Nucleic acid binder design. Sequence first.
DNA 1: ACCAGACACACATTC
DNA 2: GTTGGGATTG
DNA 3: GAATGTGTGTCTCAATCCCAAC
Length: 537
Amino acid sequence: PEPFYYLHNFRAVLAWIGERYADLLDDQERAFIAAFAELPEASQALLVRMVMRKGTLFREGKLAYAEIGDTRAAVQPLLALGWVDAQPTLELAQLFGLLKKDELSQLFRDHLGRANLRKDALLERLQPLFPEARRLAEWQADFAEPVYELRCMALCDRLRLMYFGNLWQDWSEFVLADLGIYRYESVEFSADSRGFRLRADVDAYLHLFDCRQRFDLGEPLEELLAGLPGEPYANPWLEGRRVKLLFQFAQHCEKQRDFDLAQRLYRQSSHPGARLRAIRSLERGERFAEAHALAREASCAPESDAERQGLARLLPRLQGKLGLPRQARAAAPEIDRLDLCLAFPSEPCSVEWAVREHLEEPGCAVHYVENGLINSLFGLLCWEAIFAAIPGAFFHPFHSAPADLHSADFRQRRAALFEACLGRLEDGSYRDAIRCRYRDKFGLQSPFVYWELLGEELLEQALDCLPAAHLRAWFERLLEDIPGNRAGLPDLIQFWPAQRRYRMVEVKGPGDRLQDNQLRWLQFCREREMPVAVCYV
DNA sequence: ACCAGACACACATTC
DNA sequence: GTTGGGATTG
DNA sequence: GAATGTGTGTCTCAATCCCAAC
Ligand SMILES: [Mn+2]
Ligand SMILES: [Mn+2]
């Protein structure tokens, strides 16, 4: 309805920062917000376009908007302020990004030009010839169009990182929200600001991101570790990311064959499952000695239910290749292992979708829900428990879930609420509770509540067949490890309404063999005498 | 939940 | 001349 | 064939487009 939707939403961000994050701003950055308001309606619009767009540099032909008048006119106030820069200095690398493949051939006609292979390969070709950067006028002085470079991107991304609690979300969040595509729970403005404590937390987040940026963009390890720290962080979720960065770094040291580094690195990170990869890295360096000594420290005090699974695998192999005795390990009994061989030639329909078709009977129906039913059914019961605001949970409106979810204190900071809601599960009114929370909070962008899947018909069936104790067992387990137990469950779930009873079943072809996350789920089920099975084809 | 978990799929190797 | 991935769009 | 690793492919609103693709 409003052509300047992107401008109004951009104003809404700077307005939010002026209100709440006033003291967290700097002298020259306050001047930016003030000066921005003093730009024409057209020049405010033209600026924000170049931000939302991916690139930093912009060919004038690509900045053709109708909301804004003449692009060459509305840009002038930005060129005056220096926020935009005409006649910018750019490299051969980012010159390719602006020009088409055809135009590049004309310019480099008699300067080593062959029948091109690939654009990224052409860049690799003109690296040593034109290493130094120049202005556009210095590459093709004859070139007609002007190119605008955005000088205030660093400033912009700071305001974005402050509005949100991260950088992964972009300005599209406003559009997708206003259009009703993403509907969020209007959590109350309780913790007015846990965006950040001081600027120190921002620069930390920002410089870590720069290393990540300089990693995908190929740069050697010795360069990226020079700026990194050996000392951990104080801010909880910030320390978690630095750690998570070291993890993704160690992966590359193992993807390529340099296990000495990967191994030494995995131990410096307190990331989930990093301890394991340190052992598997030693294993793959003929370091069985220190692989076992470390594996012992894990055996004496594991990291999670998943870690325990890894040790059972690794220990016999290390103990074996060492002089030690091969300590025995455990295995799972294939519960209700049903099999069926149906042969057909053509139709490429989904495998899991086809099994749903076969189990269909006049007495029982089956739904294709891999970790979907129990997740949503949990996220509704403990809905109000999750979206309750702690002093450092929520801050901006467009948030999917409470920020302290991956933190181990997620259950502790809500230990009261979760126990109040879960009380209903063994007590009465677990059906009346879910229903009210189903109708009231429908369609919202909640974690582990897949609305688009859970239909009104399915829900009522599950509530009857799925018993109190089994729901009482499942949900409690998710709370032990939320990031860990969110995945790995039976593809299908069947219900027998008459003599109320259900049964979950994972379906596999011979080409598959189930995963570690699913295996851990089948164990938990057989232990509690939960009707479950595996189906082969 | 920061180009990711989250399913199958495809290779290798070993008691 | 093809076709399809990805920045762009609201 | 069992059970092991590890390495790929797929995909997040949907309709538009243009530029570089084997
Ligand atoms: Mn599945
Ligand atoms: Mn399956």
